[PDB]
């Protein structure tokens, strides 16, 4: 058992029935508050991506909002820029947008039309994968820009919600798996 | 020239999200690794110089504040606490309503985010009217935290955000009218 993974796992805390009945909410806040834990999370993700893609990445894409907490740090670790995929209405200039559902509601994601040029290689990062709706919407938009999505990564994966399978055949990797 | 790497990576869009606003887009700073690194480094060096070893935590403001908070905290060897838009955080919370340049909103913080006395520097991407950053200071004030300083990448000086935070020290890398 990797001690690095334990530093992350030990800092996840759970709240039942938030924000709606029957949801078991995984709170990442303690990971951010513990510098040792955050550093471990970024390092583990970066190690995976370095080994899996050999540096052949152009940009990291961070997902509004909790994905914002990991995107830039991960990109910086890898020497890469970070592109923003945001909740609809937040980004200026020409955009594309897509509707989707997540575990406990629905929303719309959006990306600036000039965020990526055709052919550019991207890895998508978010804090947690659940139903995979949010990540799938991100992949759909990056596809509209003719970007190649190499992989999607998160800190946490809720495997009972089968988000992984929803993303196929786009590869996926998480640090931690809960039901 | 480190500052110029940041300066060169701000775009502007008139009348977004509403008429009368000139929107400063930070996307290009994030997209250019050298730009982003320069920004974090400039912020970190300022804070180390100003506060020595007296900062306990960085607090980053949902959402665009999240882009800088964790990086800045990591650079300084500190943890980052989250101040989120109301409704987003689990557990017992405090919240406060406020006006920003182009709308109204509400921020929230977890009651156990901080212990009384602990010293915090608040980070956000951009300071306009100062309403957001002020609301964040209020929330920290209710937890009896000591807010040492507020910082941002961009400051819109004609909106007098600095005066709303006074006498709390404020520092920004870039200034526009
Ligand atoms: O796999 P899914 O079922 O789509 O759920 C996962 C997504 O939902 C949450 O975001 P949320 O919409 O709560 O916004 P936030 O990031 O601002 O918390 C979470 O941060 C993921 O992005
Ligand atoms: O100085 P003020 O007048 O308060 O305005 C500045 C704030 O407004 C913007 O946030 P916004 O509410 O647009 O949400 P976002 O961070 O998700 O873009 C920006 O990110 C600052 O936090
Ligand atoms: N169960 C959960 N916990 C935390 N964030 C989530 N986003 C979607 N589902 C979630
Ligand atoms: N003029 C502006 N540009 C970008 N972000 C902002 N947040 C508040 N006012 C803003
Ligand atoms: Mg999210
Ligand atoms: Mg903001």
UniProtKB/Swiss-Prot annotation, chain B:
Changing residue 107 to P: In APRTD; Newfoundland type. Its main location: cytoplasm. It catalyses: AMP + diphosphate = 5-phospho-alpha-D-ribose 1-diphosphate + adenine. The modification Phosphoserine is found at residues 1, 12, 27, 63. Pathway: Purine metabolism; AMP biosynthesis via salvage pathway; AMP from adenine: step 1/1. SUPFAM superfamilies: PRTase-like (SSF53271). InterPro entries: Ade_phspho_trans, PRibTrfase_dom, PRTase-like, UPRTase/APRTase. The modification Phosphothreonine is found at residue 132. Keywords: Acetylation, Cytoplasm, Disease variant, Glycosyltransferase, Phosphoprotein, Purine salvage, Transferase. It is found in: Cytoplasm. Pfam families: Pribosyltran (PF00156). It is an enzyme of class 2 (transferase). GO terms for cellular component: cytoplasm; cytosol; extracellular exosome; extracellular region; nucleoplasm; secretory granule lumen. Its EC number is 2.4.2.7. The modification Phosphotyrosine is found at residue 57. GO terms for biological process: adenine salvage; AMP salvage; GMP salvage; grooming behavior; IMP salvage; purine ribonucleoside salvage. Belongs to the purine/pyrimidine phosphoribosyltransferase family. Homodimer. It is linked to Adenine phosphoribosyltransferase deficiency: An enzymatic deficiency that can lead to urolithiasis and renal failure. Patients have 2,8-dihydroxyadenine (DHA) urinary stones. Catalyzes a salvage reaction resulting in the formation of AMP, that is energically less costly than de novo synthesis. This is Adenine phosphoribosyltransferase. It comes from Homo sapiens (Human). The lineage of its organism: Eukaryota, Metazoa, Chordata, Craniata, Vertebrata.
